[PDB]
Design a protein around this nucleic acid. Structure first.
Ligand code: CA
Ligand code: K
Length: 345
DNA sequence: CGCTAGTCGACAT
DNA sequence: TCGACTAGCG
């Protein structure tokens, strides 16, 4: 997710009800419900005590969608993307230390203080996601396990016309080139929709708004692939892109100080950090449900080299990708975990 | 004042 | 985690 992105675009959003998508297909960033559902049972979850509470939470939102005659597609995160293996590292350690403090430091005697820590040490495993897939499948709800980030997978589904909108809490999905995003949707269907169409109404990126620039803005402000330089946020990011004349972005990156009337040096490893991050947004591997084949979110254009795009997801045989997408294989060990058949009835 | 970058709550009762 | 909010510098 991009920090403070939603406030920034708070004007391109119309309050809606999910009802408008009756008869239509809607993709879901299931992680959001999984996390919210994991909060209610933070204790049981942290101490490794058995629980199914989070499953019933996701299904509550599923049933609401069905009751409105909406066809949901639950999408799940797949493999750890190398571009994020860096940031995930820092997050692995936070849950690591956070769990421990709460676990015994507040276990003895009083407990009120500790739970605040367990909620911050919540881990959404693949085991937890598989339970939700099982529950959804039994009710005829489609589930899809992204090769890597659900974010890319969701964006693709929306672009391909497979789904009419995406349900999530993450505004950053628009940077992946998705068309419609439903935020803050409650259990009753009340949501806050943001259409990419109303997103071009912005003039903070210059006279001509561009998806390309919006993406640069998000990266410069800082994201999961590349942290921002000290003192750079969305507003400053807009200024640079807004003021900058020259098309090559790398030329502009070293020019930011010149643009921002501010004095700062851009490290060489940062230059590459922006090149990778940008390519990750563009060409992150996703799964095409129709042709059942691994494809980059965006088709490789005039000049690229897929062989150098290892950080944006490594290719694997299409049969291996299908089995992961279906939920029939473990992400890490590729062991059998299910036998769902998509080609029946 | 704008703007970045740091705590706090989420669910459930 | 993730946004919503505040504090505190340019
Ligand atoms: Ca995500
Ligand atoms: K930042």
């Amino acid at each position: 997710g991009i920090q403070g992105l939603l406030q920034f675009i708070k004007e391109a959003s119309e309050p809606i009800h999910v009802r408008k998508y009756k008869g239509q297909v809607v993709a879901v960033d299931t992680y959001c419900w999984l996390h919210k559902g994991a909060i209610a049972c933070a204790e049981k979850l942290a101490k490794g005590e058995p629980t199914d509470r989070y499953v019933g939470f996701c299904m509550k939102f599923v049933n609401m969608l069905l009751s409105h005659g909406i066809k949901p597609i639950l999408v799940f995160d797949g493999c750890t993307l190398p571009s994020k293996k860096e940031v995930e590292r820092s997050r692995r350690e936070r849950r690591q230390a956070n769990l421990l403090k709460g676990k015994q430091l507040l276990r003895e005697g009083k407990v009120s203080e500790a739970r605040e820590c367990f909620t911050r040490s919540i881990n959404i495993t693949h085991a937890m996601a598989h339970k939700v897939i099982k529950a959804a499948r039994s009710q005829g709800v489609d589930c899809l396990v992204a090769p890597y980030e659900a974010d890319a997978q969701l964006a693709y589904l929306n672009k391909a016309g497979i789904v009419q909108a995406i349900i999530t809490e993450d505004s950053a999905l628009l940077a992946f080139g998705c068309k419609k995003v439903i935020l803050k949707m409650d259990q009753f269907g009340n949501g806050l929709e943001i259409d990419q169409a109303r997103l071009g109404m912005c003039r903070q990126l210059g006279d001509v708004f561009t998806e390309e620039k919006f993406r640069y803005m998000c990266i410069l402000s800082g994201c999961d692939y590349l942290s921002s330089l000290r003192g750079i946020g969305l507003a400053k990011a807009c200024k640079v892109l807004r003021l900058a004349n020259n098309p090559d972005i790398v030329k502009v990156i070293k020019k930011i100080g010149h643009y921002l009337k501010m004095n700062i040096t851009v490290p060489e490893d940062y230059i590459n950090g922006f090149i990778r991050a940008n390519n990750t947004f563009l060409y992150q591997l996703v799964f095409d449900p129709i042709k059942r084949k691994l494809i980059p979110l965006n088709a490789y254009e005039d000049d690229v080299d897929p062989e150098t795009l290892s950080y944006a997801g490594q290719y694997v045989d299409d049969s291996i990708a299908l089995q992961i997408a279906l939920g029939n294989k473990d992400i890490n060990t590729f062991e059998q975990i299910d036998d769902y058949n998509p080609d029946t009835a």
